[PDB]
Design a protein around this ligand. Structure first.
Ligand SMILES: [Ca+2]
Ligand SMILES: [Ca+2]
Lengths: 129, 129
C-alpha cells in the first residue's frame, strides 16, 4: 500500500478513436512503429509514480505533474514486446473522465523494466478493486 | 499581462485523428451534437485560468490542476455558435507535446460568456507571439 516512482521514457500517447484501425495490442505496437518511421516518436524522460489511488506522470526536472490517472481510469497495463524490439515496453491504456475516447501510452521501462512497473500498477489496480 | 479565471462548463474533449471525419468547425460542432444524442456529454463545471504563459483547467472544488496548456500548444480558440443552440460555445484546439494528435475542447462560457474568454486567451496568444 505504498507510493513508488520510476524513471521511464515516454514514447507516444495516441487516442483509440472509433475509426483508426487500432483494435489489438499488436495494432497499437504497429502504429508505434509507423509513427517512429514518420519521425513522430521522441523518447521523453518522465517520472512514473504509482500510489494506492493514482498513477502520475511528472517532469524529472521540474517535478511537476504532467498527467494524473485515478486508478479507476486505468483500463489495462501490460509489458509488451513488439516484434523488432528486444526490450519490453510498458503499455498503459486509460480513459480520462473528461475525454471522449480512451488513450494508449507506450513507455520504455529502462533499468528496472516494464514488467516490474506493470506488476506494481496491476497490484495497485487489484487492491483498489 | 495578467492571470484571470472563469467558471465554465466543460462539455467534451475529443481527438482529431487522421481518420474520423472531423475537418471543420462545423464538423466539430456536429460531433458534439451526435455525442450528446449518445448520452456521452455531461456538463462538468471547471475553472479555466488564463495567464501570460498557459491556460489551465482546474477543479472548482479541489482547486487542483486537471490540465495545463503552455500557450504554444494552443492551436486556436473561438467563440462558436452551433446550429441548434443559442449561446456561443468556447472552442479550444490544442496539441499537447506528449500527444500524437491535437484535441478539440468545447466549453459553455456561462455568464461572462465564450467571447470574453476567447478574447482573453487570444490576447494572451498574441503577447506570447
Ligand atoms: Ca506499490
Ligand atoms: Ca489576460
Amino acid at each position: 500500500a505504498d507510493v513508488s516512482q520510476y524513471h521511464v521514457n515516454h514514447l507516444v500517447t495516441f487516442c483509440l478513436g472509433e475509426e483508426d484501425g487500432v483494435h489489438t495490442v499488436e495494432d497499437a505496437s504497429r502504429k508505434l512503429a509507423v509513427m517512429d518511421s514518420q519521425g513522430r516518436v521522441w523518447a521523453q524522460e518522465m517520472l512514473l509514480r504509482v500510489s494506492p489511488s493514482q498513477v502520475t506522470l511528472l517532469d524529472p526536472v521540474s517535478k511537476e505533474e504532467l498527467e494524473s490517472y485515478p486508478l479507476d481510469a486505468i483500463v489495462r497495463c501490460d509489458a509488451v514486446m513488439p516484434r523488432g524490439r528486444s526490450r519490453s515496453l510498458l503499455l498503459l491504456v486509460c480513459q480520462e473522465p473528461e475525454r471522449a475516447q480512451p488513450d494508449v501510452h507506450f513507455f520504455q521501462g529502462l533499468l528496472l523494466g516494464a514488467e516490474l512497473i506493470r506488476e506494481d500498477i496491476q497490484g495497485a489496480l487489484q487492491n483498489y478493486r
